């Protein structure tokens, strides 16, 4: 459980550190990049990352609206 939470923060920190200076995704564009960056770390765990990326929509700092995908909120 502890290492699962470790992976949970490891993916979120990477996605908030990298995607602030990159482009946006439509359906499954940036997930490939985030899995490649963590390819040497552990398994991609597609279901876990898919379930966790959609939890940040509840507030600011790149809410990643399931509506607008063309351009993301590159604001802070």
């Amino acid at each position: 459980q502890k290492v699962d939470d470790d992976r949970k923060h490891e993916i979120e920190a990477a996605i908030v550190r990298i995607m602030k200076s990159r482009k946006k995704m439509q359906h499954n564009v940036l997930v490939a990049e985030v899995t490649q960056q963590l390819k040497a770390r552990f398994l991609p765990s597609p279901v876990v990352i898919k379930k966790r990326i959609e939890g940040l929509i509840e507030r600011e700092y790149l809410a990643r609206t399931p509506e607008d995908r063309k351009v993301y909120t590159y604001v802070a």
Partner: protein
């Protein structure tokens, strides 16, 4: 000469008469729409109305003619062109415009729409335009469609209109020696899928379509598949094709003659007749094939090779009609077979040494010493290969001079002396990238895989700074082992799935020497791949550019020049 003032006065008075309906005597009845007009204007414009009125038939004295098999809008635009000379041609109604022009036999509008269609030919309407040119006899359109259809379709072979084509047209297309295919099997399966579009409507053409393809695939697979689709108990086709493939000895096509070659532009004119010329080096044939001169000796231009292996030229300057040069925003496309530069839609602003980069089917020209030079002196603009038009993109935040750009991971990476910015086509924005630790300019970069290799910079040097796109970090690898007291001219390029370098070096009181090296990606070392003998390649100059592309040695000719 004829007084133009009286001519235009007469034309505008006649158009006023047409709008006001004073001297109209004949009315065109088309699908219940009244078209009051005159006989003189119709006779002067169309060659059918001159045979409709001055013929002595029943319509000579009749004042009401029911013109059928025509369109109201097309007739209206033809009449208004005949009355004022303005032909507003859009991108949709040109088909019916040509139909009605051919029906009415009007030469001027026919020529105008023929020119518009010769300009509008592209990939997504190639087969439709070829079918249209087959329906109505038009040799110029037919030939242009032949060439463009051959190339683009043999690249794509997926158009829906290809199924609905006449037998003679397909026989001409398949049997031609201008098809561009990396293999002879894709045309085979294209013919098979076209034949299987019907069952009995194509049986008679089955004996003819196989007569144009080489017998190398007329005895292998895709013969039992036709037997599966054969009509039942038909014994006139199986035994026919069983003993039929005796003639038509296998002859290699022309599309399988593309080789990875280094295209050079603005080379030193062997004979000083012209200021510069264009040549090409053959990494496999070890020869130097000549290339067609740039359009109107267009100097200071940029090159790009799309993933579809297409060459384009943008920007440049022409000597104005001693130093004399004027910059023009003309755009051109190179024909891989006809060995000529076909003009295309010009840009909006003129450029000098533009960086042409292809991405997502769009041609990106970043910078290039624009004539504007305003607040946004860093405005970049993309080109649409589908609509044949140019569209502005997000401007570069910083104004840079003597820069290079590459495309990696579906993004535009433009490099300057020390800064780098990545453009996101999806969001149309620029993001700050890593900063180089060395101030170098007048260099070129080659995109190999997911890495950017900035080679050389300032003559140039052997400094190499490798940028990991995924790790966002600039790092040094090594320095190219060259000669002392020498000025090498480095050229980064990708060839044979490896990063090679075209470096020409010159010693003191010695002529330039040509040699290329293969850089080991894992070993961080430049290995001698091949040495270019001076017996075939002569001096090219300093402002010459190199690019990676494929060309046909058969269509091109060897350059006659002494070693």
């Amino acid at each position: 000469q004829i007084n133009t003032e009286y001519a235009v006065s007469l034309l505008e008075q006649l158009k006023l008469f047409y709008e006001q309906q004073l001297f109209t005597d004949i009315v065109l009845i088309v699908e219940g729409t009244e078209f009051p007009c005159h006989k003189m204007v119709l006779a002067t414009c169309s060659s059918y109305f001159r045979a409709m009125f001055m013929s002595g038939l029943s319509e000579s004295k009749q004042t009401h003619v029911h013109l059928r098999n025509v369109d109201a809008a097309t007739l209206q635009i033809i009449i208004t062109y005949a009355y004022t000379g303005n032909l507003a041609m859009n991108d949709s109604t040109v088909e019916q415009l040509y139909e009605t022009a051919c029906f009415l036999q009007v030469e001027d509008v026919l020529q105008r729409c023929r020119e518009y269609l010769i300009k509008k030919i592209n990939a997504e309407n190639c087969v439709r335009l070829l079918s249209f040119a087959d329906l109505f006899s038009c040799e110029e359109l037919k030939q242009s469609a032949k060439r463009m259809v051959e190339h683009k379709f043999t690249a794509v072979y997926h158009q829906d209109a290809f199924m609905q084509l006449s037998h003679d047209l397909l026989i001409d297309i398949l049997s031609s020696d201008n098809l561009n295919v990396e293999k002879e099997e894709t045309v085979r399966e294209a013919a098979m899928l076209w034949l299987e579009y019907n069952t009995e409507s194509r049986s008679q053409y089955l004996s003819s379509v196989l007569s144009q393809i080489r017998i190398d695939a007329l005895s292998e697979v895709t013969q039992r598949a036709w037997f599966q689709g054969l009509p039942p108990n038909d014994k006139s086709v199986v035994v026919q094709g069983l003993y039929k493939s005796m003639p038509k000895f296998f002859k290699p096509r022309l599309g399988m003659t593309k080789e990875e070659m280094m295209i050079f532009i603005e080379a030193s004119s062997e004979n000083p007749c012209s200021l510069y010329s264009s040549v090409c080096y053959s990494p496999q044939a070890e020869k130097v094939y000549k290339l067609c001169s740039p359009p109107a000796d267009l100097h200071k231009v940029g090159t790009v090779v799309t993933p579809d292996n297409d060459i384009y030229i943008a920007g440049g300057q022409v000597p104005l009609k001693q130093t004399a040069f004027r910059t023009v925003n003309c755009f051109y496309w190179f024909d891989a077979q006809q060995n000529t530069w076909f003009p295309k839609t010009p840009m909006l602003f003129v450029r000098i040494k533009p960086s042409l980069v292809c991405c997502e089917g769009y041609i990106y020209a970043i910078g290039g010493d624009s004539v504007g030079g305003e607040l946004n002196r860093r405005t970049v603009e993309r080109y649409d290969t589908e609509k044949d038009e140019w569209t502005m993109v997000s401007p570069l935040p910083c104004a840079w001079q003597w820069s290079a750009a590459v495309v990696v991971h579906d993004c535009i990476y433009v490099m300057t002396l020390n800064l780098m910015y990545c453009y996101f086509p999806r969001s149309d924005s620029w993001v700050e990238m890593a900063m180089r630790q060395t101030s170098r300019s007048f260099a070129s970069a080659a995109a190999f895989g997911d890495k950017i290799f900035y080679i050389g910079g300032l003559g140039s040097s052997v400094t190499v700074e490798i940028y990991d796109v995924n790790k966002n970090e600039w790092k040094m690898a090594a320095n190219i082992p060259a000669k002392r007291y020498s000025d090498p001219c480095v050229r980064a390029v990708v060839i044979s799935n490896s990063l090679c370098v075209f470096m020409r070096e010159t010693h003191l009181n010695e002529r330039a020497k040509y040699v290329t090296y293969q850089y080991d990606l894992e070993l961080d070392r430049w290995s001698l791949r091949q040495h270019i003998s001076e017996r075939v390649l002569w001096d090219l100059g300093r402002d010459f550019r190199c690019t990676v592309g494929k060309l046909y040695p058969s269509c091109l000719e060897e350059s006659p020049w002494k070693p």
